[PDB]
DNA sequence: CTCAATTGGTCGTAGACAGCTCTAGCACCGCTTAAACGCACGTACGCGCTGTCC
DNA sequence: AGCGCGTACGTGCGTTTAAGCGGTGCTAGAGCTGTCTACGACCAATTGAG
């Protein structure tokens, strides 16, 4: 699964974050970094989805999670 | 069925007040009001927090300007307190 | 009405109504809804007005989450105010740095 | 003939700062987000908006640390960044303790 | 100007002149006297390692 | 003038951890600002958490999910252990 | 009373010992302007928020509450005063 | 006659004050520096010697954070300490303006 | 199409708000000397590169 | 990135400053308390905006 965040995904989102040349190590990084980051937040909406008694993570489950982290994202309803 | 309310009218509303031309796609519109929303709330707990630092009960329109003072950067804020001033004093001039 | 006894677009009786529900106060004085919704509908005002301003420079008959990114991002107040916060489909500024460009 | 290496580079940056749509491979991001969190609960569900938005927060978290991390670079006066460079950035954050 | 002077004796010649050029834009990276000791010491069959050196190898 | 603090609650715990150790006046000051800190941040929590649920009666179960959000993990695996504890004593009282 | 240039009561030794017990062995004589400049601009984030609490508060006084509120809203919470 | 060599004794006064707590600037400048900029926003404001103490701290504390994080940024290629390029680097990547 | 917004009215109390003081924060002198300044000095680590590696 | 270059800023020291103490004066407005009612909450009856 983790690998299917393929390099020329990882170097799509480099070249959006304006890196010119990439040392293939970073790709493992940022699929370790992008998994430790995940967990934090899959972890907290998990942590409303419980205490809301749902099986379902909603999209607010989600954006409280990030609201949260300080990650405020726009988009799915405050 | 589900009734979900939203500003989006009164975002559209003031497009066509800012643009008449041109609209705002959905998406947009949702960004909009998740933005509203968290203004809203950034300012309504801002003076909720000043209200208890005064002890005070009654958040009033003064607990919001200087909400309004703090949160927002100084020109915005500046500009956002002259609207509100100008807003309060209509509403005052009408019953 | 009360948002035309004020002149206002947003819903004063709504702003009134979630302060109330939002349990940030005891009571909320008649003047502060007037004026939140005021400041809500300042703020909104200027940043649809610096999204149909880019979608003129974008050549777009509706703002899409691209405009509201770039007129975001490019204002120094509101990127002060949303520096913490993130817009679907919003993209980045153009950002390269001179030692990356050739000379 | 042959472009000198890094002249295509410079050319897709300008197209993915262009660009705004997700660029992660929806499914496989959806499958290791299902993976992650059966490991918090079973027999989860997932709102198709949730994932989306998921992915939305983690690309532009991504895209912020690779601005950082190229800057960090920059710093080290090197094209070329590195974990070193994205540890640095994530530290001076204190995401990373 | 000064060089040519030493290898077109007349300029009224344009079949030497457009003959040499193509050796001026091979050089016309260097000028000063001191980058191109630094260019000819640098081509020394033993350079030194401080550019000073490489000038008074190639002086 | 009637200035609440933890200053006694404080004492009491101490003389749980180590009897035998003093805290200083502007130590005790510190404690008393981290507890009313993580009073509102738990509390604040709290609110949100039953803003979303539409809940408008605080139980312990959102205390407890707060705590799980706020704290690291250990940590708040322990503080779950003893909320949870100390709610069956006092259900047993 | 006009206060003036009083950012010179920032002595370079004073910058110095901070850069001590920031780990900084070395330290260049750039950094203590440019530190200078970075402390000035906090004290006028910390200030202007205290300042606008005592205006709210009506108070003439600026007190350790407020700059305690005023840290707290900056996201930098401070303990041993209070809030 | 005795003279400790660079760094010896910095070294010794880093471990000094970072076994040491007090505050590091001088308090009564301090003082006045909070005055002038306070009057820039508001004449005739009276500070809480508490207050004053407690931007110190403040001031301090956030300072010296910030001089980690820039001593932090000298690593690369063996690079020795700060500069102010090192301060604004990690200011940006904190997004401090 | 409908229930959230709306109004005139009562209630009763939040807080206006005015007085009252005396906390502690304002100035102020003035002596001590830690610390600031400034100057010398030098050596080490910030600058440089082309060696060289992919 | 090894190694050269070199002058920056560390260690020192001698002088100058004013931070600190602290001793003393003053005062203003922080905060307390007491009086009133403007006000927001609740309400029934009303309307049409979303």
Known sequence: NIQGITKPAIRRLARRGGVKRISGLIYEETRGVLKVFLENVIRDAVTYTEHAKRKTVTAMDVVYALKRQGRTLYGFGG | ?95 | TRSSRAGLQFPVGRVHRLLRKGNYAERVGAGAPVYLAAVLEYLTAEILELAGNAARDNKKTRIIPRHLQLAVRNDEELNKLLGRVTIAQGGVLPNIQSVLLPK | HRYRPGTVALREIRRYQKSTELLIRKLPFQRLVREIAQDFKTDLRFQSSAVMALQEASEAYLVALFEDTNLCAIHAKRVTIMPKDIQLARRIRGERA | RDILEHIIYDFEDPEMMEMVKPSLDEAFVIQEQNVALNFIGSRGAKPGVTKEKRIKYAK
């Open chain 2, 1 to 95: 069925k589900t009734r979900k309310e939203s500003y989006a009218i009164y975002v559209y509303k003031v497009l066509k007040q800012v643009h008449p031309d041109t609209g705002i796609s959905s998406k947009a519109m949702s960004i909009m009001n998740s933005f509203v929303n968290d203004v809203f709330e950034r300012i309504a707990g801002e003076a909720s927090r000043l209200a208890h630092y005064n002890k005070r009960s009654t958040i009033t329109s003064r607990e919001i300007q200087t909400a309004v003072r703090l949160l927002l950067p100084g020109e915005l804020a500046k500009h956002a307190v002259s609207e509100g001033t100008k807003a309060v004093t209509k509403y005052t001039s009408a019953k």
